[PDB]
Design an enzyme around this catalytic site. Structure first.
Site, PDB file in Angstrom:
ATOM      1  N   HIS A  42       0.869  -1.225   0.047  1.00  0.00           N
ATOM      2  CA  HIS A  42      -0.053  -0.002  -0.002  1.00  0.00           C
ATOM      3  C   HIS A  42       0.922   1.224  -0.040  1.00  0.00           C
ATOM      4  CE1 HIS A  42      -2.552   3.010   2.311  1.00  0.00           C
ATOM      5  NE2 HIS A  42      -3.316   2.723   1.251  1.00  0.00           N
TER       6      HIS A  42
ATOM      7  N   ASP B 251      -6.004   2.047  -2.015  1.00  0.00           N
ATOM      8  CA  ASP B 251      -6.716   2.150  -0.910  1.00  0.00           C
ATOM      9  C   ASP B 251      -7.320   0.544  -0.862  1.00  0.00           C
ATOM     10  OD1 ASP B 251      -5.571   4.324   0.009  1.00  0.00           O
ATOM     11  OD2 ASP B 251      -7.098   5.562  -0.205  1.00  0.00           O
TER      12      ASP B 251
END
Ligand SMILES: *CC(=O)c1ccc(Br)cc1
Ligand SMILES: *CC(=O)c1ccc(Br)cc1
Lengths: 121, 121
Positions: free
Chosen positions: B47, B89
């Site tokens: 991420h 996300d």
């Protein structure tokens, strides 16, 4: 740096920083200033404002020296910005400690919408 | 932004994002990234790398639109960076959810103790 900030909070409050403060009210944690929920949140509010006064130094990651002397946070010199960064951190740590009495867990986990515009620091 | 993110994380995992991920392992949470401690941590790792490849928008503050449809995160059109952001996300939310069975509080409220170091994203 987050590492000494957290450490100072630990030493002052005796509390796990990330957990009690990592996401707390509008000012304690990620993001910027917001209208404080309580005295604790305020501490972080004042802390971020203190962080603005800085130029040169990076609060999130710039290391600095300080010692725990007679259960007091004392940073040695580090230079202008770093030193006053420590003082910012010291201040918020003490402030969080001084306000443990009104510490409210419902503000512990986090939600920001309710966080209205913050007044100029 | 982190709202979209914490929210996707809540929708997918069902866990309070701040509490469960705000400080987890070397990558889930505050600033830098390190030596993934488990799949979960690794998720936040990817991420962050995903956030770093991003250009044109701000992952922490930039708002974007997405919806929850058929219990799936669907990134709204927004713009390419915002969209990429949303995918970063969504990807981490899914991954965290995918690794809930291996999630270990041990690493929660983790102080970044002995987190190896950043391994080129
Ligand atoms: C400035 C301040 O009080 C604060 C508290 C928690 C985290 Br995470 C970052 C900054
Ligand atoms: C990239 C990621 O998973 C993450 C999780 C929590 C926080 Br705070 C920042 C980043």
């Amino acid at each position: 740096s987050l590492f000494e900030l957290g450490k100072m909070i630990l030493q002052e409050t005796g509390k796990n920083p990330a957990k009690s403060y990592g996401a707390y009210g509008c000012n304690c944690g990620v993001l910027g200033r917001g209208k404080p929920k309580d005295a604790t949140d305020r501490c972080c509010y004042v802390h971020k404002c203190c962080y603005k006064k800085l130029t040169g130094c990076d609060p999130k990651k710039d290391r600095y020296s300080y010692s725990w002397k007679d259960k007091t946070i004392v940073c040695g010199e580090n230079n202008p910005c770093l030193k006053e960064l420590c003082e910012c951190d010291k201040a918020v740590a003490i402030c969080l400690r001084e306000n443990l009495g009104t510490y409210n867990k419902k503000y512990r986990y986090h939600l920001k919408p309710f966080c209205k515009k913050a007044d100029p620091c």
